[PDB]
Structures are given as structure tokens and as C-alpha cells.
Amino acid sequence: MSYNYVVTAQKPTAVNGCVTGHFTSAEDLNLLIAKNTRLEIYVVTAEGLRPVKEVGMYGKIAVMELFRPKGESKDLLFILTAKYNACILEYKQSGESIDIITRAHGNVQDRIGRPSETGIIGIIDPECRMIGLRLYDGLFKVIPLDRDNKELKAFNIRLEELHVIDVKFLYGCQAPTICFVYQDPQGRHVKTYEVSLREKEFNKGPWKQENVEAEASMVIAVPEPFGGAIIIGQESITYHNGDKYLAIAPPIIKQSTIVCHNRVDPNGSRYLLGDMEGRLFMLLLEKEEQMDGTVTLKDLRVELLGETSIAECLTYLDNGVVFVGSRLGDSQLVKLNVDSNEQGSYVVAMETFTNLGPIVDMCVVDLERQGQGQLVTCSGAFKEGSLRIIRNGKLHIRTVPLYESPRKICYQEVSQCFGVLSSRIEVQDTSGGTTALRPSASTQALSSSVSSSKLFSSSTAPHETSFGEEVEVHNLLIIDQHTFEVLHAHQFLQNEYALSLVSCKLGKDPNTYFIVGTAMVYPEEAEPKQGRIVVFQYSDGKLQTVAEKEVKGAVYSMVEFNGKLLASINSTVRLYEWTTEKELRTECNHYNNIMALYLKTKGDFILVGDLMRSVLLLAYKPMEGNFEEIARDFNPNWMSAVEILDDDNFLGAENAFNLFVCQKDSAATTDEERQHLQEVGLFHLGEFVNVFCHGSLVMQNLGETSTPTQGSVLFGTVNGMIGLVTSLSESWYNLLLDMQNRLNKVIKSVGKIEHSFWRSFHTERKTEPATGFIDGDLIESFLDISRPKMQEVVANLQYDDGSGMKREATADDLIKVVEELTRIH
């Protein structure tokens, strides 16, 4: 009865991976970039980046590595998806026609196994004798790179080391040989193994196991002439090769963890390293000659080049230019100068590339014109953090840099401003409290008002705090809707985290308030035991504390509900009325939750999203002043967001990157059966949804009803993807399902992945086919194939145009249909 259509409004922009090589031709230096379903191919030029190709895959790309077997004139490409579809691909270009040929393909899924904590790891031997994969604990998977291995059959080798951190193949080995860092009760260690194909087993490695620093975290395999291995930790850098050992401990690196690496010089003399604070360093290997003409390591040095955006990945490109691929902020092309600039930096930004992710929250507001909704998102994280204001017309995005982390947003029309929670990191000062590490919005506001609240500062056993601990400082920012200037910043108490915010009116009170939920945060507590609801009024350019309500736990959620305030505090849901004396008064409570994290309402009905009891459907009863449990989805699901499509349809998103839709049991003959929600829709989306919201960014066609789709729910993702979910009739659902099956019979899938397999609901507990959801991207892909291909797709297709009797469908009919679908976003 629930039939859904899902479509991309803006593809995800975050980069999950990037590699450089010579893939499109031997002479070009190509950069290939992975955005979670999309693969972008560029050629690196003297001026910047030239777009060459964009493709979609039916899968989350988890590994992307170039390699060149013996006898190949240019690199091949190995890719593994999150659903363990493995493929070897070759680039083929002729004229304006570009094709990706499948050189090898196969499903490498094991029948059983727990995917590892440190995620998929994939490595290729430098001589391309084999591929090595760390997919499951206790095993190292080897794919021999024989040309006949077209099904990508593999074999498993036992690993005695169950918790591998990183592994690389070594250079200068007669057989493929791995070196890897692991952790065990004795500490962390580095060890090596030779790889015997005949025995399909490890043999003793060329050098013994060595102890390394307790926080050794990454391994780099150094090419010739150096050979050996680099072990990167948080406070030290070491190099190992046989009897050769060389360690340095430059203090400069201790402040922030190094998180990515890429080889800069072909001979291994220099590498670049990027940290979580955006610092960019060069690590330099000094050579020592030997009597036999070999080269050994003389010394190690680290040199700070400067600051960049927080880097997910780095690639040295050419001409002193580096690409910095970021997932938490915009990606960049930066220039490295031999001499520093006026401020002492050797790094110069050349180009910036938009990243909306992570989109932690958003709202819809008719910012410019009535009825023309725009989306306002809290985008980014730390010094890269921002607000983003997105509207169509492809789209325009305005950026408001915050240089700290925004968390939540609401709009308060009567004051013509926005309230935004934000937070920044500060570190301990020399003698006093804490000091910030950089300027940010909360430190650059036009005005400020510290919280003078003492609601539980008295009669609360204080909890000490030690030295070395950094602290987070949270603020409520009042932001002008027109200028986006920081009008006010209200800083909360030390160790107090502002977590939720709503702007709404309650009861008969004509004032409009900002309502904030908070939590007192200490590192050692397994759960918060204290929180507040705080009611502010905005007038005369400042926030005034109007009222407070103390609770013994974290105020995870608050929502306006029929002129009352529903709030979730640790294991309780409480409904408060706003009295004439400006106080919250309990009407009723509901307790059958572990932690009620997400709330939405519609009329007198309440949808509750639980931490672990996935969803509950409640109704408020005004004539009884209490709650009744209406129904529940008895299937466990770890929710990340929820939304109400209507009184009978309930949307959910879960941590395995799937969506589902629940309905009441229409075929229920008893109260007990009536109490069971039915999961009627399932869909493997492939993204993590953090927020749903009602609204639309298309110009409203006043009198828009009598349309192929019904309803509009937008959602935002970690990767910056924006999507829309809408409802369909039964006939349209059947039509689109037939169309998708037929396209799957016609469309060539890169890596030979079936669309049904990709979109199939999949967890570690259960695997079932999808139902009730149309992948609108697949539907829209019809319009880009040639007309004979369209005719074949629609060949012998029965179709009912408008209202009437069924007839043969023509390609132009489906062009019209899909074009109509495309206008909903």
C-alpha cells in the first residue's frame, strides 16, 4: 500500500578516495576520485583539473587501486565494493566514445565472517604478482593475478594476528612479502611474512619482529633505492630494514594525529603527511652511500609546510602541487613553494572544491520569496565549519564560514533571525582556564552574553578535572537572516553541551521563545545524569533567560506538540504545558523507552524513534491527558532518523544505510494484532541519513495535484547527498518496477553488479529483496541512452497512457514520463 520513489537532488560531494596514475593513457597523469557511488576521472594539467568522465556505480566503492600487470602498456584498475563485488577494469577510449571494460569480475564474499573494526583494507604487490585484502579478522585474502582468474577466485591464509592495523607489501623481495603492524597483549609489534603461492601459506619473513611505539598506526612501504619500511605513530617516526633501525621523535607532530600519506618523490626521499588539524608536513629521508653502491638511510627530518583543510587523503600531483581530498570540508588544490610567504607558510591554495558534508542538521525557509523554499544546513566541522544556504537555479550555495562546529538550527520569524548551536575546541592555558586554538564565530560575534545560570551549580557534588584535558565550548549564535552576520553569541557553562534547540510559541503566551536542551558532560560517565531545558526570549539584540527546568539526565529531544512541549530526557518522555506564570508543568509521561532520540509529530499523533527499540507510534489523548501505546515495529532497528509520511505511513533510516517504511496492520482482527506495525517497504539506500524534513526546492506549480507522485520528504546525508522520497500509486509502482527490470536487462553494469543485488536490503543478520521503493536515479538514467537503445528497452512494452485502455509503449512516451519525474527535484 506504501509505494515509494526516491531521487537524488544533489549527488554526494564528499570524497571517499583519490588516486593518481596513468590510467586513461600512458602520457597523462590522471586523478581518479571516489564519492561513495560516483567515480570521477580527471587529467591533471598545468592550470588545474580537466573533467574527463563521471560514472555511477551500483555499489559503495571501498577500494580503488591502480596497477599494471606485466605486459600491460598502462595501468589497470582494481575496485572492491562494500558488498564485496570485486572487479579489474581497463580504460578504453576511441574518438568521443569512452568505455570501461571489465577485465575481471567476481563476488569475493565469504559465507560467514564478521567485517572488521578497522574496515576494509586492500593492497597490491609492487610487482603485481597478487592482490592482498584484509576483509575479515584472522584471514589474509590473496587473489593471484593470473590472466585466467576472470572470476576473481581467491584463497584465504590464516593470520595468527587477529587485530591488524595496517599492512603493505615490501620492495626488493624475490617473493611477495607483507609487513604489517598489529596489537596484542604484549603491546604493538611489526612483523613480516613471505607469501608462498605453491603452499598458499606464509613463510618466515626476511627480518624478525620488532617492537615499535605503542601508538604506531601506519605503515609505508618505501620503494628502491631505500627499501625497508616506515612506521608512523603519534609522537615518533621509525624506519626498519633488517639490521637497520632509525627513529626520530620531533615534538612538532605530537599535537595532532597524522592520518594520511602519499609518496612525493619517486625515489622515496620525501613524503607528505597531513593531520587532523590540517597541518601539512614533509618527512625527508637523508641518504647514506655504501661501498657496494647501495643506499641506506642516514637520517630523518620533519618539516612543517603549513596548514590546509582537514585532509581525508593526499596526492602529490606535479609541479609542487598537491591535491588534498577532504570528507569533512572542501577539497583543495594547493601549491608548495620552496620559500615561505609573509606569514611564514610554504603552502598556497590554488583551488577549492565544495563539500557540504557532514550535513548534521538543516531546515527549510522561504528565505527570498514566499513559497520558494531554500534549505539552510549546518555544514562542515571544525575550522572548515560553515552554514550553507542552498537554492535552485544548477543550484546556488551561499557559504557562511563559522570556523567551528554547528550542530542544530531553527528559524524564529518574529525576530527575523536564526538560532544556531555551535561548539569549538579549546586547550588548557598556562595558568587559568582554557584558551582557544584559533578564532571562530563564537569569538567574533557582534555581542555576547555568558550564561549566569546557577540552577544546579549549587547542591551538586562537583567532579574534579585533570590537566591536559581539552574542553569544548558551546554557544548559541543569533544570526541575521538577511546578512548572516553573527548578531549574538551566548556561551554556556564550562563542560555544558548544548544539544538541541527549537523556536516555537506555546499556550496562550504571545511571546516567541528559543528553547534549548543541554547536558553536563564529563568524560568518565557512562550516561548523562543532568540536564536543563532553558527558555530564552530575544528582544533588544540580546537573549534573556526567561525560564529553566532541571532534569536528572540529558535532554536529547524537544518538540512543539499542539501548543505543548514534548521532551525526551534519558529514559522518560514528558509533556509540559506552558503556564500563565511562565513555567513548565507536567501533563503526562511515557516511560517504555531506553532512550528516545528522535521525535516528529503530526496532529495528535507522535512518532518516537528509539535508540534500540526502534520506533513507537503513540497518540496523545486530550480528554484523558495521558499517552496510549498505539503500535510498535517489533523488528529491531538502530535508527538514525525518522519521518511521518502520513497518519498511516512511517519513514525510518537505519545505521546500515537502508531506509524502510512501516504501516499499521490493515489485516488485524485483534487489539494485539492491531498493535503490530508492519515493515511494508525496504530499500538499500547506500547513505547514512542524519535528518528528514518536509519541504521542497522546486517552484510550486500552484494546483500541482493530480500528479504521478504524492508527498515530498527531503533528507540529508553525511556525504552531502540530498535526496527526496515521495509516494506512488500502485499502477505507477508496477510500471516503474517493470521499467527497472527491463533496464537491468539492457544496461551494462560496471563490474557486472545486478541492480537488484545492489539495492537489496542487507545486514549481518538478514538478506531480503527490496520492496516498495523506486530508485529514481535508475529511472532517470533512461534518458541518456541512444534512441535505438530506448526502443529496445521499450520494445514489446504494454502501456496505458493517461486514462484508458492499454497499448504498446513507444520510447517517446517513456521519455515524457521520466522527464515529468525529473521536475520533482
Partner: protein, 361 residues
């Protein structure tokens, strides 16, 4: 690590899902320390031997006794639970799983020697097999839905495997003595586990083997085995002995173990044998205790209680205890949901759900 910060990081993509699972494991243990208030109790006649949950519904449960007496009970209903009696002397039910199709049905294995499928209103729909000669009876039973197969164990060493409509092509002997437990994987369909008094536990491939111990893998032990249960994920096998041990074997090279969880659950004649169990949505283990003066105790205080361990580490994390229940918890089973626990002690059924909340007007 103050979860909410980690939840935000996960929303940023920084923190991985398993880290979240770890934090929430910590949270569930923290609230499990508040299950201490024993909510409900329910008696009937002779000892309990098998336990099962209604999969879809949280508050409904089924239990099978020493005297072929089955009970089906729902909470918050007060409608005087559903009962069905049997012979009462030598018809001890020993295996009990719901029907994946018609939840008002149930399979059953009986000391009488009749693997049956029967309704909660009493009508026997079908017998599946039979001994036809006393002193040879069934002890264990389990079912799989994805393949629609049934499997059941004897007191002598032979296992039987049926389809949902009959069609027996199995009944080769696997062991030399009684088979206490046997089980199927839920996420795959075609590897099997069986346990025996022969001090060995065996992993089969039900489609390939036909040759009377042309098995797939064999894991030995020092003592007999009372249970061998798979994970929900399918990759971790739990095994539980009769003297003092627990072992965890992995998907990766079944032979060698990952870890030993030593804990005494010693066997006895009139006692119901003990059955460790997983928790469906975490990496926990739940077990009942039975003190032994000869076991080398690390703790100076040794009381009978329900212990809760971690799977992939080795050590404990929680202990449930409540007076007025100083008997020994033979059976312990969590819900598929993760919010409820049931215990079956001798002549007693206990419910341990979470306690007091605040109130409304």
C-alpha cells in the same frame, strides 16, 4: 567516552559503526545493572527442560516441562495463561521451537520418542518420526526456515533430518552416545553443528556428506558437551561443556579456539542441563552459575547468579542476582528485541525486566 559526542562523530562519519556498538553495549550493561528488581514469577508442576520465545512479540513466551506439559504465557494480559498437559511421568518434552509460519503452532520432541508438530489447542497435526522401540528416544531439536529443514537428536548417537513435508533422506548415525544439542545457521543454510557425549563436537555440511562420518570438521574437548550454539551473524560458535569451561570457535579455522571463558556449570542427574546463549544484537554471552568447591576460584565469594560476559575479549562485565530466587538458573534466554530476559529454574519461571519509572497525573 560519553556517547553523545561519539554519536555526533558518527553523524560526521568520523567514528565507525562498531565503535557505536561498543558504546551502546556499555550502555545496555549499565541499565542491565538495574534489572535487579524481579518483575514477575510464574509456577507450574515438574521441572523445566526447554524454553522458547515468540519471535515477533516481546511479552509472549513458550516453555516445556519435565512431564510433557507445555505452557504459553503473555505478560500484561492477565488472561490466565494457556496450558496443555501430557502423560506426566515419562513424556518429558526436551525440544521446543516456534513455527516460523503459523505462530500458533509449535514443533516438539518428547521422551516418548515422537518428533511432532502440534497446535497450542492440543490437536496434533503430524508426527514426523518415531522410535517404535523404547529405551531409544529423542533429546534435542531445532529448525531452519530459510531452507525449511528440521533436525533432531537421539540418546544413542544418530541424528535425523527432515523436510517440512516429510521426505527423510538422512538418519545416518553420527556419534557413539547421546546428542544433547544440535543447531543450524540462520544466515547461511548449509552448514550444521552437533554436540555429543563423545567429548567431540562436529560441524557438518548437510548437502555434501552421506558417508557415515565423512564429516567436514571435528573439534575435540576434554569433557562432554551440553550445548553448541551458533551466532546470529554466523561466524562465531559457542560451546559449553559439563565440568568447567566455555569455548569460542570462529569461522576462521574451526579447529583452534579464540578464547576460553572458564565458568562452572557442573552436571547433575536431576538438574536440567545448562545452556549458554548469545544476545542477538551485541557480542555478549549470558550463562547460569553452579558453584563448585573444587574449582580454582579467583573470587573469594562464590554465589549462584547469572553472569554476563563479553564474547571477543574473555572477561566478565555483569552479574544479576535477586533474593527470593536463590535457586539455580538452569535456563536463561533474552528476547530477540534486546529489552527483556526470561529465566527457567526448577519449578519456577522468572522475569527480570526493568523496574520503576516516574508517573503521570
Amino acid at each position: 567516552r560519553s556517547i553523545v559526542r561519539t554519536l555526533h562523530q558518527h553523524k560526521l562519519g568520523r567514528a565507525s559503526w562498531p565503535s557505536v556498538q561498543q558504546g551502546l553495549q556499555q550502555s545496555f550493561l549499565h541499565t542491565l545493572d538495574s534489572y535487579r528488581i524481579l518483575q514477575k514469577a510464574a509456577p507450574f508442576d515438574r521441572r523445566a527442560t526447554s524454553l522458547a520465545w515468540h519471535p515477533t512479540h516481546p511479552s509472549t513466551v513458550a516453555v516445556g516441562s519435565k512431564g510433557g506439559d507445555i505452557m504459553l504465557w503473555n505478560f500484561g494480559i492477565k488472561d490466565k495463561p494457556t496450558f496443555i498437559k501430557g502423560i506426566g511421568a515419562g513424556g518429558s518434552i526436551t525440544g521446543l521451537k516456534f513455527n516460523p509460519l503459523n505462530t500458533n503452532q509449535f514443533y516438539a520432541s518428547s521422551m516418548e520418542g515422537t518428533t511432532r508438530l502440534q497446535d497450542f489447542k492440543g490437536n496434533i497435526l503430524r508426527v514426523f518420526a518415531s522410535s517404535d522401540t523404547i529405551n531409544i528416544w529423542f533429546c534435542s531439536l531445532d529448525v531452519s526456515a530459510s531452507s525449511r529443514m528440521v533436525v533432531t537428536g537421539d540418546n544413542v548417537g544418530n541424528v535425523i533430518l527432515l523436510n517440512m513435508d516429510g521426505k527423510e533422506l538422512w538418519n545416518l548415525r553420527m556419534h557413539k552416545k547421546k546428542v544433547t544439542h544440535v543447531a543450524l545457521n540462520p544466515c547461511c543454510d548449509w552448514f550444521l553443528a552437533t554436540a555429543s557425549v563423545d567429548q567431540t563436537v562436529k560441524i557438518w555440511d548437510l548437502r555434501q556428506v552421506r558417508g557415515k562420518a565423512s564429516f567436514l570438521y571435528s573439534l575435540p574437548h576434554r569433557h562432554p558437551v551440553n550445548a553448541a550454539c551458533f551466532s546470529p551473524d554466523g561466524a562465531r560458535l559457542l560451546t559449553t561443556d559439563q565440568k568447567s569451561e566455555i569455548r569460542v570457535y570462529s569461522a576462521s579455522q574451526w579447529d583452534c579456539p579464540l578464547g576460553l571463558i572458564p565458568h562452572p556449570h557442573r552436571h547433575f542427574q536431576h538438574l536440567t542441563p545448562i545452556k549458554a546463549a548469545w544476545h542477538p544484537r551485541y557480542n555478549l554471552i549470558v550463562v547460569g552459575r553452579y558453584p563448585d568447591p573444587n574449582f580454582k576460584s579467583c573470587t573469594p565469594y562464590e554465589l549462584r547468579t547469572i553472569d554476563v560476559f563479553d564474547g571477543n575479549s574473555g572477561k566478565m562485565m555483569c552479574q544479576l542476582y535477586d533474593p527470593e530466587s536463590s535457586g539455580i538458573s538452569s535456563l536463561n534466554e533474552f528476547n530477540p528485541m534486546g529489552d527483556t530476559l526470561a529465566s527457567a529454574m526448577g519449578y519456577h519461571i522468572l522475569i527480570w525486566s526493568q523496574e520503576e519509572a516516574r508517573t503521570r497525573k
